[PDB]
Every structure is written in structure tokens, then in C-alpha cells.
Amino acid sequence: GAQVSSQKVGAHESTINYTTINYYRDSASNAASKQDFSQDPSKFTEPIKDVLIKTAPMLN
Amino acid sequence: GAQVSSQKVGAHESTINYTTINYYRDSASNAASKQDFSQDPSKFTEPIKDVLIKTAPMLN
Amino acid sequence: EACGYSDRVLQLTLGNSTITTQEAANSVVAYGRWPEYLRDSEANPVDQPTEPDVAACRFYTLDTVSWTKESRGWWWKLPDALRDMGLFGQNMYYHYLGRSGYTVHVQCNASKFHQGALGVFAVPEMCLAGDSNTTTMYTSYQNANPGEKGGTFTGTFTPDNNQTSPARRFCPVDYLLGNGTLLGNAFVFPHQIINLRTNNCATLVLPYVNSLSIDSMVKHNNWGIAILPLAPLNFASESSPEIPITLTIAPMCCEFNGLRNITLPRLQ
Amino acid sequence: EACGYSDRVLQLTLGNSTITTQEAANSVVAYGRWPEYLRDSEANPVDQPTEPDVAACRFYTLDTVSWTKESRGWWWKLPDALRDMGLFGQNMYYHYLGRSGYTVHVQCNASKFHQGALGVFAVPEMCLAGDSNTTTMYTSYQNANPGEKGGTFTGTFTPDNNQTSPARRFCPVDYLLGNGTLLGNAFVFPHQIINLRTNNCATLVLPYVNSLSIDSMVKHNNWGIAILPLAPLNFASESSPEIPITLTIAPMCCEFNGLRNITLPRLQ
Amino acid sequence: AATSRDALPNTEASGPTHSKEIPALTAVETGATNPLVPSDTVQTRHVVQHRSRSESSIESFFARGACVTIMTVDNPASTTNKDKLFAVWKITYKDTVQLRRKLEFFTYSRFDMELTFVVTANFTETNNGHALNQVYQIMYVPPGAPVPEKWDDYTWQTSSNPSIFYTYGTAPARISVPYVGISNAYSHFYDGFSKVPLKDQSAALGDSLYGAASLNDFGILAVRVVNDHNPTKVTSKIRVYLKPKHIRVWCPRPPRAVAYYGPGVDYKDGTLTPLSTKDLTTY
Amino acid sequence: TNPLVPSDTVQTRHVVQHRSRSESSIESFFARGACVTIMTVDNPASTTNK
Amino acid sequence: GSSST
Amino acid sequence: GSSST
Ligand SMILES: CCCCCCCCCCCCC/C=C\[C@H](O)[C@H](N)CO
């Protein structure tokens, strides 16, 4: 049940990996993976009904 | 001898699993798996000799 | 479009009601989510919902207010502002639970010689600050819920010193967005600006937002509408200009659960 | 059925309401037509109809009346009897037009030692006769429409002799079915009889009936419910027996057109 | 598939322009922010961008234990007139300010909660008596369960409530708790009341606090020294640290700009002037 | 006991139920250490009478 | 080796 | 056994 993931190696001395085994039944007990996703800011930066083309006039 | 089971993941950050190894000869020393079964309440809620059909009269 | 279509010219039709505009600045859909009915996978009350459709999902116009050089700003809460609006309000008070989205259309025209800019903000859970420094969280239900008349912002915090019979109302200071955070940051909430030289209206389409799929509309407001003058009204060289601001709001995809006798709230 | 099912034992469920009965005499569907929504081929107003579904198509219980040896009979009109019933009534008064079918459940239990028989009649266009022999067709809107309390029949015609301030009400004589035709023939209308030794209820499912697809519910009643003692109440050897009669009625497949502000009728 | 530790976009080289394309001109009335990048308004070179937003992911921004309370307990001489102090704390992140302000950048959140307990003790009277090593009991009493009235009453049995028996001088205690809300997310702000005032009912009867939902939202922690009374009095403090693990957040908000004043959004007179003097044309 | 569910007596909508009885299994109901006794002992001076 | 549930 | 990310 071991999970093997790669580290993003910053300062250097192949891929360096690290290992993780969950010891508990409850997922709440797990550490944080930090394997997170990004999204586009559009729902906040461009919430307009008609798609914005930045080279065009915003008002036409 | 490792046992690998899945966690029911509640709050999220695939299947997340966890690992279990029993360290002792006596099953009494084992932790609780919590992998438990449910049953129908009928032996207490419907202990009648003739099967009950809920849309029908209980007395006929 | 070469057939004449424009960002500035829109028509909105809901139920037996239509809004037209010839000076829009496009329109906003809050968080990019259009209103929707509650899905079965997210459903919670099990009884058949009531869904009034055109009887309630139509444009209701609230009482017109007036913008002047001394105006500090206005606020309304939803669904509260619509609690007395035709069959929407009836459906609301007859049911324990209700959920709704909204099309909010703020109207304010002037002339090519007037100037000023209104920030129109839709805020989820718009908790406002109270008038008291003797008791926190003390604003009464009646004062928290003005209905369609709404409330106003002030440039000055003034604590209620009557300890014997406290006012128990909000004291929402404008540069602090009525809630202790700086107004210049209110733009992270879904918004539009009515800048008189550019546009004469704001249109915000609001999804139902909450930490629950459905809730008590009578106990809880989901959205707050806050309108503040970002740039003050001005005209020619008149010292006391005035232009009206009208709010028209339509419920969208509203559904209700838990039907019983009607709620008769203490509102004064 | 060998699994116990009976003609006499029924359960009816509409919206959040259920009726049970253990002493029914089957149930009637007027003219063999179950209620239906208005079909496109028969439609007339073009605006999107409101169809309240469970909010209005549910059982409403009216005020219980009392049957005694001197009772001559009772009457109600539909939709009038339901004009103040929850969201059905609201939907009715907010719209110019409305149509509806009904499940009518008349309730009256007694004991194996009581006797009597109530004729329960559903009459389309139940026009009743007035109290006047000075002016015909003079019963006022207010008197023609009692709401849920209904009206009563009388064994005697008595003309209103006050010419200065006329009563302007109905004078519905029982053996003349309140309308100048013999009661013994009322059985050509959809009916059931509550004969106490046999059954404790009547159930009539009424389709929307009219010479139009939809109409003004506020101006016009489609159905009349007339309940008359065909055989008088009697019990043991008591001179003054009483048993209650309760009406519970549910609108079915109701839809409304022509939404505006609410109607506020002169009812007194 | 874009991850938090991915490099941000490269700058593409761009040259002079003379056209009808007008990226620089926009109209903020629309409610949108102009999505510009340097090559839209100046000449750029090609740059291979290596920087990432890994440390500002919601998880990373919150991946720290913050102190939310300090609980005081003691264990006195048996002869004292005052009762042995045990502590009762209503669980909340609003008794301190730093984690509260961070969570309040958002309206709603979901997370698993990690609680870590740091325990310190000292002597109080200018005595010379000693005390043997203390064991502490941290009992979670959820809404409805009997709250302890005495350091030693029956509730400390904990047959069903979760308790931690912590030994002094050992590693700080730690437990995890799942997302336990009765809603689909935690509400950092609730614009409403827990009661509807009815006309037919008295005002007192229909009244409730603004913005407050369940009176006992999450219950309490009750802490005691399990050791019996000792001739020399020792006082201890239990510091509680909260870390939101596995977190999701919704609906961004402007951060708290004036001092917190209570559990609500209320503010105090005299604290409303955060900004300082600076002249319009002074750098 | 009559095995009824809401759709037996009222009009219902379709709901996809996510709740479980995991925490009320017999194991989970008892999965806690409970105090059953407190034993007292001591270690006195050798000179004590007790 | 390893069981899997 | 082993997952690999
Ligand atoms: C043995 C120690 C066990 C400790 C168990 C603690 C369980 C209670 C968890 C409390 C969760 C608090 C989350 C924060 C606050 C809420 O977000 C807001 N006020 C909105 O609901």
C-alpha cells in the first residue's frame, strides 16, 4: 500500500522520490499530500456573460 | 502479510488506501478493522410468522 | 455583429416581464455560475418541491431611491427585499425551506453632461456591523430586514449610547463596506460599475449561494446588494443635483420545501 | 383481493396529504373523466401558465358542520369554498384566469345503532334560486359566495319583503334542489350516498367542467357541492342526535393564466 | 491537470506594433479585469519562466498550526478554600485573530482539523515543596453531553466522549478530526438569525443574535489535572493549535481591515482608521 | 412495526442519499475506552504505624 | 505478501 | 503494493 511520488528538487548536491504509507483507516488522519491543482481566475476576473477578447474594444 | 484497504474519503484536498500489519500471534491483540456488516431489522421490526405486505391490510 | 448587435444593447425576458437597455456594460454572471434547480445528487429535504416558475421568476421593481451629492450608499438583502413581491413572497412565507437565484438589474440614467460612478456589488453572506459598542451581534431581526426599502451606508460610525432602549440596528460605514473590510477591495465580489458617461445600468445574474443546498429564506439572507458612489454625482454647476436609482430584481429557478401554514413575521 | 384489498378501504394521497378510509362505497369519477391539464389543441390564453402542483393540489379541510334531525341540507361552490385555502387561493386571486379539477371527500361517521342517509351531489353550474319575488337574478356576489362556510337549504320558500333594503340572498328550497327542479332527479348528477349503516364517506373526483377551456375563477363557480339528508338522522331513541360532517377537498391539475396584482374582492 | 507547482507561463518575445488592436484600452464597468501581460503594451524578450505558485495554493497558505486558545488549569493543596480549577473552552477559531483573518479571506470552507496541544506548568507560591509529574485529561464534550461541574465528577469517565490523557514533558498531544459540519461547508459568515420572530409571539420569545446559527456550534473542550491535590500548588496552561488540513474554500472576501470586535463583524469606535497619511504626489 | 418510508404517505422527489450508519455499528458505538475503576495505592515512610 | 480489500 | 505518482 505504499505511495511513491516525486519531489520537485530545488537545490542539487534522475527523479528523487519519497514514500508514503497511510497508517490509519480514517482519511482525516492522513497528512496533506500537497499535490494540488491550479485553476484559471476567470470566474472572478472575467465573470461577464459575453467572452472578452482583449485586443478588441471591451464595449462595442 | 500486509493488508491494504481503502479509506472512505470524506473531505478532499483515485482510491486512498491504508496499510495494516498484525504484529502479534493472538487475534485479541489486533486493532478493530471497522469493516463491519449491516443487517435488516426484521427479526425485531417484523417478527411475525406471516410475511407482511405494507400496502395490504395488516389484518385480513 | 454586422447585423447591428451590441454589448451595450440588451433585452432580458423572464415570465411576463421584459427589460430593455441601450447603454449596458455587458452583464455579469456571478462566479460564472448560471442559476439552477437543485440536483438529485445534492438534494436534502425529500418532499416534492414547489417550483412556481413564471409566477415568481419574473422582474419585480422595488421603490426608487434618489442619488444626490450627499448620498453615502444603499443596501438590500436577498431574499428579504423581495419578501412582499407577488407570488414569490407568498411561496417564501408558506414554506419552511426555499432556494433561489436572481437577475439583479440596477437602473440609473442621466445625461452626457452629468458625471458619477456607482459601484454595484453582490456579496454572498453580507453580514453588516451593528451600531453598538455595549453589545455585539445585537441588530434585531426587524432592523436587519428592511424589506424593499433597504438600508443605507454612512460615512461615520456613531455608537448607540441609549442603554435602556437600544436602537439595535446596523451602522454600516461606507469605506469599511459596512463590515470592517476596505471598500476598495469589494471588487473581489461579483460587480459592475454604473459610470454615467459609459453606462446607465448594472446587471448581475446571481446563482443560489450557500453552505447548504436549501435553507430558511425567512431566517437567512443569501446575497446582499450594496450600491456605493465610488465617484460622487455631479452636474453642470448645480450644487444640488439629483438622479433616481431603480432596482428591478427577478428570482430564478426558485424552489421550496416543507409546506405548512403561512409565516407571519414580526417586522416592526 | 386474496391479499385483503377492498372497495371499502381506500387511501388517497395528494401533495403532503393523505386520507384513509375503512368504510367507503367505492369512489366516483364524474362523467368518467379524470382531471387533466389544458391540452395545446384546446388552449386559449397564450402566456405561460402557472401550475402550482403540490403547493395547491393537496387536501384542504373546511369548517366542520353539524347534522341534526332538523338539518335541511348544505351547499358549497367551487372554487369559492377554497378561495382562502393556502397557496391555491393565492394563485387564484393573483391571476385573471384559472382552471381546476377536484377530489371531494365528504366525511361522516356514526355507529351501528345510528341511521340516516346523506345525498352528496356534485352539480356543474349549480345556479341557485334567489329570495326575491320583486327582482329576479338579484343575489349579490357576497351572498352567492359564502367561501368555506357554505350555505344551507331550506324546507320553505320565504320571499324577501324588505324592498328598501333587500337581503339579496339565495332561498334554496330542498325538494326543489334549490333551483326549481325535483331533488329525486339529482342522481343524474355525479353523486354518492353516505348511508350510515353502509359507509362513512363520499368521494367524488371532479374534472374541470365548463363551456370554456379556462375562465375567471373569481367571477364564476364551475361546480356546486350539495349535501341533503335523503333519510333523516336517527339514533337509538334520542330526540336530539347530532353527528358532524367534515368536507376535505383537493384541487387537481390546476393552472392559471393572466398574472397581475392580486384581486381584493368585496366579500361582505 | 495544471498543478500548483507547475512553472508559470513564459514571456514570449514581442516587437513593435501599429494596429487597430487595442489591449490597453478597456472598460472596468463591465466588472472584468483586463487580462494583460507585458507583451501587450511593451516590447518583450523571450524568457523561460521557472517560478511557480506552489506556496500560495489554498493548502499551502493554511498549512500551519495556529494558536486558537490558552486553557488554564491547576492542582492546589487539599486544604484550599478555592476549588481545583478545571477549564472549559467553547471550540472556536475566533478567540484569537491571526488564523481567523486568514480563514475570513473566504466565505465558506471544508477541512479536516488537526489539533496539537502544548502544555506548560509552573509553581506559584514561594514555597520549596515539589510536585510529581502531572497527567492531564482533555475531554471533548460535544453539544448535548454533560459538561463537567467538578474536576472529579462522573463525566470524566468518558465512555463515549473522546479524551486525551496527556503526560507532562512528553511530546505535545495531537489528534485529527474529519470535516464535522452539519452543513456541506463551514460558514465563516452567516447573514441571518437562528429564529424567526412571529407577530403572535412576544418579542423576547422570537429574539436571537444576529449572525449566530447553532448556540453550541461544536461543543467544548474540558481540561483537568488528573493527579490528586498536592501540598504545593501547580498551575498549568494548555495551548491549543489548529491546522486546517485537506482544505477547500469558496467565495473570496476582502480581509479584515479594522480590529476584530467580538465573534461577529462588528467594529469598535476609535479603531476605524487603519490607513496612514501619505501625499498624492509623494513617492 | 409498519415499514413505511415517506413516499408511502406523501409526494416525494428523487434524492440520492449519501448518508451512512457507519458510526452506529455495534463496534463503532463501543469503540471508546471507558473508566471502570480507580485503584488507590501508596508508599509510606517505614516508620509508619499503618 | 499483501492482501487487498 | 505500490502506487506511483
Ligand atoms: C479529544 C479532542 C477532540 C476535539 C474535537 C473537536 C471537534 C469540533 C470541531 C470544530 C470545527 C470548528 C471549525 C471552525 C468553525 C466554523 O468554521 C464556523 N464558525 C462556521 O460553521
Ligand SMILES: *C(=O)CCCCCCCCCCCCC
Ligand atoms: C502496502 O502498504 C504494501 C507494502 C507494505 C510495506 C511495509 C509497511 C510498513 C509498516 C506499516 C504498518 C502498518 C501501519 C498501521
Ligand SMILES: *C(=O)CCCCCCCCCCCCC
Ligand atoms: C507480510 O507481512 C510481508 C511484508 C512484510 C512487510 C514489512 C513488515 C514490517 C515489520 C513487521 C515486523 C514484525 C512484527 C512482529
